[PDB]
């Protein structure tokens with residue numbers, strides 16, 4: 305695999321979003337992944353609608369949490385593969401209450417056919433991401449509240465509680481790291497991103513790595 309990859313530099317990653325006071329991280333993780341996969345399938349970079357999952361994916365629990373894999377399955381199994389544009393289905397859960405699903409008045413922005421579940425192995429996740437693009441992951445982010453930058457080297461790695469998006473890595477740096485997109489505005493971390501040390505399963509990053517497939 306390449307020594308280093310950063311999908312942001314290819315133009316493949318949308319702007320950092322803001323989940324607000326809702327536990328909808330899982331939806332931002334899944335949607336961010338789809339956004340990138342859709343672009344990498346040869347389509348214009350498009351902001352897609354977390355609110356569609358938060359409100360309409362009843363396998364998951366909206367502002368009380370969810371799984372990215374369930375989101376990918378819901379899109380395929382319950383919405384004919386379709387993901388609406390953010391423009392047509394704006395986020396409406398920032399205060400912590402997700403409104404009822406609305407099926408009308410939205411515009412399809414992307415489609416997916418399925419999803420893959422990646423090995424629990426940082427090297428194999430990196431090799432896959434180098435070729436196929438950004439990957440949704442679950443992490444322990446309990447220690448992330450105060451992060452303002454730098455490579456995180458002592459992440460509390462005890463329980464999965466957050467969903468984020470791997471967009472790159474760097475194996476050659478003095479402390480090798482993952483490059484991770486979060487959903488807590490650009491005011492958090494490194495313009496909304498975090499780097500965590502790579503190779504020691506920091507924050508349990510290898511446990512639940514997956515990606516949508518665009519056909």
Ligand SMILES: *[C@H](CS(=O)(=O)c1ccccc1)[C@H](CCCC)NC(=O)[C@@H]1CCCC[C@H]1C(=O)c1ccc(Cl)cc1
Pocket residue numbers: 326327328329330364365367368369370371372442443445446464465466467
């Ligand atoms: C998003 C994480 S968060 O709210 O951004 C956050 C806040 C403080 C510290 C760290 C993170 C949500 C929060 C749910 C509960 C408020 N997390 C998730 O949805 C997790 C994402 C990865 C897999 C596990 C998942 C989770 O905790 C969960 C899934 C399903 C159900 Cl029913 C409940 C929880």
